């Protein structure tokens, strides 16, 4: 019987980040690990540079996404994708230098209207428990946003604390219920894959690795 | 509490505030509907650009980072990394005055990005040690870098309230500098009916006459913008620091927010209006209300009155549901009012930015 | 360190691993099942590519029961010593005559960095803006290896007076995949036979690589002069390795190494082929002009969806006088496996002089049947596109306008934002139905396919004209775009 | 508060069409959820510069076209008795990026203002090349130290440094830029408007009178809300640094032209010469527009001009009290009314408005 905490992803602009090194931004269509991660690390108050605790919270702790489709007079909205024509003014030329270029132009894809409802428990390796956790998302020390610091929260991270043994039937506790869910957790009766880059390599930043998700279709 | 919520409703006469790689207006839907949007690095622009940033942050009494200063810290931060007459090298190099000479004004804390930069000189003044080039040598070879953060340590409060300026001579992981405000995408409250001006270029020396054509997007509404003061991060970058300065910084941000609007178009549309609402809250979590504008207003009269009272009555009943506690204070232009108390009623600005600047207290 | 001989491969185990490093021999020989492990999905793709121009290079097969056996079963290491020993001498990075994939007696003013060699990190301006630096910092010789091939084939630069090859510039590369990675290395290798057919050795075939025997500045090269194995090591770059380092971490793979590489020395080197080469690992397009006949190989030129492209990747058109040309690794399975599923990896990049815009790289699942029934593909294709032109058709025209009976044309571009939308919206219904048909039974699934279609044009039509349609001007206009969107809807139905 | 002064004029018009459509229809744009019938910035620019106040009281307009073939005739005209035809067509290549072939038509890239006074000065320039010879790039880069002399000479423009002016080619594309002064809005109703149409026909001396089908053209009358702001110390600036007394000269002639020139489109057969019934400037550190005060389109109690007054002084009352603006701020009116507060002084006549603003404020 597991311990989950849920909380909630819902602001009016998203995005979740995809193999790139280039100006085109893509996005997908729900979170990344690498994204709650950073998340919870920026709840926490983890500096980029200590390998440690980035590291240890990773380890520690585990995620499964819901999908939630929003419903508004009775009227399904589905998600839509947006590309933001982003130009700076005086970037950097060289990584050392103080010379610039005049413009430099990226597009960035956003995510409206996007909400998620997610739930995270620890891994038995684990260096911290979910009291920590549920105190920091509901009392963070850096700025949270999805992903990108464009994008705030409409509703509140923490939505509520569970015990279950599956984190579906986690998630049935609360009430958007019938969107599709993509878990680090596998379930009966359950087949299907999904690949994604999104296992950031911590040792060496900044760059990612694959991993997969497992898929749960409801109705 | 931690985070200072800052909400704007804003209305703008016909005009292009924002464009897209195709001159048309950028926008974002949003429950469904489609919404005209002023990009958050245009307004973000706006304002680190803007005359009364230059007059209140620019040249803030905390922009100069003296590292005479911060020479015993410096020592038990990177004690552990370095050795103590590497550090005293660099700072020799940075400053450049050798003395100490304890200024009787030693700090206790350190901003992280100094520390995250002094290392990356420190390394590299060790490794010119081992080489070995001498200090002159090896000053060549650093003056762009030297220069680099030589004019950082001057402009302390605009890199902790902005954060650094897109091309600045930062190396280390640590030299990436955020927050300490985060302005979101400011998006209209109401579905826009877009117009579209078709305009001519006329030729003084044939008058007859061929028309050069043209076209160009423009749509007036009102706008509702979002942004959130991160405290304990902004008196870290500034470290420092006392509650209050960040809270007479916050105050700067509040005004710019109420007042500052972006240059695209404006010499030829001209939307030069002021915030017909501004909201202050203090909160243990960021929150934006635009989910009060979901459900696209519709103009009864106007699309600001709807707006105003959609805001209230969304604040009203969500409010307490999450976490949003106080203190809160709104400043508008027009009644209603949120009928919950607990949301100070402020008849000007500078009544409500003198709220802020006390912590929220009455 | 030798590719062959010694430990270069980097991978990890299927359901779950820590991060190996790998020789040839131990791949090839062994039951257990590898699968690639790097930071970038590209570097896999070229390191997958040469290992399959490596494995087709020391063991083609005699028939397709030999094949299907080395595929299912593995080798025994005398066997597989046997086979690699003629070639042990051509895989050194470090050499005094012939290095791999290198020109010994290079002279330049000065050192480039390894961030050339990666693709993407240092190619434009906003790369500097937007990436991680120090990428290039230190390089292992196994991901230099990759890197060198990778810029060799899949990469666009150096542009100047640098010359790419043999197939051109992004070309796409479609390899079949298997559950392991040694599956999949021997599921791409040309059988002799075959290997034979599509390069007829008459000749006057030179077939010694660019470093064995170098290239001749300026030289006019037939391309049936070329051999298959100068051809699939083919580099044009004319580049050399600085000497290495010590040890340390590597930059780009995030594993120690014996020995890692700082910088390479380059300088200009052009020439012309005549003709084209048959890579058996990209497909080609042939049109007709009109006349002459043009025959070119895939690649990425917009941003549209990878289903797009499915036709040109699985289905060979021989109705010339304008036909498409499958690749030869495809064209194989087909034949060698009729009765199976297909999980085809495809990828490549798009190019605007040596830096790039966008890199893709895709698996594509179809079901069983793909071999035979291809018309069904090349039908879901081309109604998905069609309903694609038809919604950009109809938003053009309300744009543009009427000139004849005066009607007047909004004057913006919604046609480009809506096609986004519906390419987006496209995703999640093409290559998920494409995955999951029976083709011998499915044209009902194509037709509930053709009403999601026609209800999304509708819908998307209308939500990118909703907000100009409040002025009679362009109320006006609407009207006969409206027309003709449903002039076009209407003749998308069978 | 004294950098930006601002100016803000409601003015009524009887029916007519001061700005068209590609259909010919009047310009509008959607505010409120209202429509509004809306005149061009554009327009209104050039009916300022082509007026006849301006040439009286401020000088000659600028040119401005595409048309080289021509310019370079008009050029040797006015300016061939004190230069020579080969420095003349020299300095217009130069500027240009054009040549000049003495060719029939050689068209530029886009439309471009030019003012002879500035081009005579780049002949005077271009002639020390007839000195000890600097290459073209040289004498580009000895220009592009003093840009200030280059903008002395546009007091010959005082357009271009109000509306300023972008060039794509030639010399003119590093030495041309200007960027400021003024920034106007299009003039919208305050009110809705249900637009009228004029069903007109044409009798035939040979033939009628007999049947004919109608044609049709699109008229409104409407209380407009025009709004000006002016930059001085870029306006200044774009001067070559010319005194402020000076810039506030021309302001105040940009606030009579505002309150009093109509563009001339359809005046000839709907006749809309009116005046303008309220005219107020203040100045402040940063542009301010109460356009929002008509956000909430005005419905008419005795006519949209009195409440129109009436909105916009409240909302003024609202916006100045709210962010705690003190002006310099003065109020022209022709209807009597109960406007406040102090210290919006009030202005019996348009002249001591203007006076008012030659004096910065204090007057
Ligand atoms: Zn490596």
Redesign the interface.
């Given at each position: 019987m597991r311990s989950y905490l849920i909380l909630r992803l819902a602001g009016p602009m998203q995005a979740w980040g995809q193999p790139t090194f280039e100006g085109t931004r893509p996005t997908g269509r729900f979170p990344t690990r690498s994204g709650l991660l950073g998340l919870l690390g920026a709840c926490l108050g983890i500096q980029r540079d200590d390998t440690s605790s980035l590291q240890a919270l990773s380890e520690s702790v585990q995620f499964a996404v819901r999908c939630d489709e929003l419903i508004l007079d009775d009227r399904r909205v589905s998600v839509t994708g947006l590309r933001d024509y982003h130009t700076v003014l005086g970037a950097r030329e060289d990584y050392r230098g103080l010379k610039s270029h005049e413009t430099i132009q990226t597009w960035r894809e956003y995510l409206c209207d996007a909400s998620f409802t997610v739930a995270l428990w620890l891994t038995p390796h684990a260096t911290m428990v979910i009291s920590e956790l549920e105190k920091a998302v509901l009392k963070p020390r850096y700025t949270p946003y999805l992903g990108r610091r464009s994008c705030p929260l409409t509703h509140p991270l923490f939505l509520g604390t569970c015990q279950a043994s599956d984190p579906q039937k986690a998630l049935l506790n609360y009430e958007p219920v019938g969107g599709d869910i993509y878990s680090e957790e596998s379930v009966t009766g359950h087949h299907l894959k999904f690949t994604a880059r999104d296992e950031p390599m911590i040792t060496l930043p900044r760059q990612f690795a694959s991993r997969e998700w497992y898929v749960i279709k409801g109705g | 509490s931690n985070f200072i919520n800052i909400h704007v409703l804003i209305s703008h006469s016909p005009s292009c505030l924002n464009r897209d790689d195709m001159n048309m207006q950028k926008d974002a839907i949003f429950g469904g509907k489609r919404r005209v949007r002023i990009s958050s690095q245009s307004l973000k622009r706006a304002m680190r650009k803007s005359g009364y940033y230059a007059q209140n942050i620019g040249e803030s009494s905390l922009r100069t980072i003296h590292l005479a200063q911060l020479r015993d810290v410096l020592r038990q931060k990177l004690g552990e990394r370095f050795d103590q007459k590497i550090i005293d090298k660099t700072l020799a190099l940075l400053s450049g005055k050798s003395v100490d000479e304890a200024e009787k004004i030693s700090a206790d804390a350190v901003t992280p990005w100094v520390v995250g930069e002094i290392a990356w000189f420190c390394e590299q003044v060790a490794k010119a040690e081992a080489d070995n080039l001498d200090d002159k040598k090896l000053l060549k070879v650093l003056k762009e870098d030297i220069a680099a953060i030589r004019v950082n340590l001057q402009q302390g409060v605009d890199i902790a309230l902005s954060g650094r300026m897109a091309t600045s001579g930062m190396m280390t992981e640590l030299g990436k500098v955020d927050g300490a405000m985060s302005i979101a995408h400011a998006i209209t409250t109401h579905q826009v009916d877009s117009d579209i001006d078709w305009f001519t270029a006329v030729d003084d020396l044939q008058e007859q006459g061929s028309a050069h054509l043209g076209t160009q997007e423009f749509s007036s509404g009102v706008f509702y913008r979002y942004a959130n003061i991160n405290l304990a991060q902004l008196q870290e970058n500034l470290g420092g620091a006392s509650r209050e300065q960040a809270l007479e910084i916050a105050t700067h941000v509040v005004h710019m927010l109420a007042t500052e609007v972006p240059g695209a178009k404006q010499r030829t549309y001209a939307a030069f209006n002021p915030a017909d609402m501004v909201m202050v809250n203090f909160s243990d979590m960021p929150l934006s209300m635009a989910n009060a504008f979901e459900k696209a207003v519709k103009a009864k009269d106007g699309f600001l009155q709807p707006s105003i009272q959609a805001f209230n009555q969304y604040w009203d009943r969500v409010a307490n549901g999450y976490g949003l506690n106080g203190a809160a204070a709104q400043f508008s232009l027009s009644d209603v009012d949120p009928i919950t108390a607990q949301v100070k009623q402020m008849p000007t600005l500078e009544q409500l930015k003198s709220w802020v600047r006390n912590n929220g207290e009455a | 360190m030798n590719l062959l001989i010694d430990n270069w491969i980097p991978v990890r185990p299927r359901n779950g691993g820590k991060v190996q490093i790998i020789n040839l021999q131990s791949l090839y020989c062994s039951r257990d099942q590898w699968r690639l492990?790097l930071?970038?999905?590209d570097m896999e793709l070229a390191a997958l590519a040469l290992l399959v121009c490596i494995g087709q290079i020391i063991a083609p097969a005699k028939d397709d029961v030999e094949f299907r056996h080395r595929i299912m079963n593995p080798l025994t290491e005398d066997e597989f010593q046997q086979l690699i020993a003629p070639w042990i001498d051509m895989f050194y990075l470090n050499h005094a005559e012939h290095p791999f994939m290198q020109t010994k007696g290079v002279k330049a003013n000065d050192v480039t960095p390894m961030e050339k060699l990666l693709?993407?990190?240092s190619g434009?301006?906003?790369?500097?803006?937007?990436?991680?630096?120090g990428?290039g910092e230190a390089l292992c010789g196994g991901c230099t290896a990759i890197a060198l091939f990778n810029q060799a084939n899949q990469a666009p630069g150096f542009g100047g007076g640098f010359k790419s090859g043999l197939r051109g510039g992004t070309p796409v590369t479609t390899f079949v995949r298997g559950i392991d990675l040694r599956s999949t290395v021997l599921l791409n290798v040309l059988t002799l036979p075959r290997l034979q057919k599509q390069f007829p050795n008459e000749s006057h075939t030179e077939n010694q690589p660019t470093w064995i025997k170098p290239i001749k500045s300026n030289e006019s090269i037939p391309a049936s002069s070329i051999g298959f194995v100068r051809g699939l090591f083919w580099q044009p770059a004319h580049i050399e390795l600085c000497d290495p380092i010590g040890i340390g971490?590597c930059?780009?793979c995030?594993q120690e190494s014996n020995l890692r590489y700082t910088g390479f020395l380059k300088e200009k080197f052009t020439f012309t082929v005549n003709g084209l080469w048959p890579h058996p690992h990209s497909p080609c397009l042939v049109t007709v002009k009109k006349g002459e006949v043009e025959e070119k190989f895939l690649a990425f030129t917009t941003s549209a969806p990878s289903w797009t492209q499915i036709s040109r990747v699985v289905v060979d058109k021989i109705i010339q006088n304008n036909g498409n040309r499958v690749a030869a690794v495809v064209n194989q399975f087909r034949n060698i496996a009729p009765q199976s599923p297909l999980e085809l990896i495809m990828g490549g990049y798009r190019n605007n002089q040596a830096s790039?815009?966008?890199?893709r790289?895709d698996?594509l699942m179809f079901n069983q049947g793909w071999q035979q029934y291809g018309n069904v593909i090349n039908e879901i294709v081309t109604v998905g596109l069609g309903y694609k032109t038809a919604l950009r058709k109809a938003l053009y025209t309300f744009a543009e306008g009427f000139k004849n009976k005066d009607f007047?044309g909004?004057?913006?571009?919604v046609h480009?934002?809506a096609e986004?939308?519906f390419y987006?919206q496209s995703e999640l219904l093409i290559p998920d139905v494409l995955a999951n048909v029976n083709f011998s039974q499915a044209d009902e699934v194509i037709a509930d396919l053709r009403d999601k279609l026609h209800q999304l044009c509708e819908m998307l039509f209308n939500?990118s004209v909703?907000?100009?349609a409040?002025?009679p001007?362009?109320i006006s206009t609407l009207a006969l775009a409206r027309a003709t969107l449903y002039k076009h809807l209407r003749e998308l139905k069978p």
């Open positions: - | - | 492990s930071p970038r999905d693709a993407g990190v434009a301006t906003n790369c500097a803006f937007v990436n991680q630096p990428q971490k930059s780009c995030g790039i815009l966008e890199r790289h698996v007047k909004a004057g913006v571009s480009e934002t986004r939308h987006r939500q909703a907000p100009y409040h002025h001007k362009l």
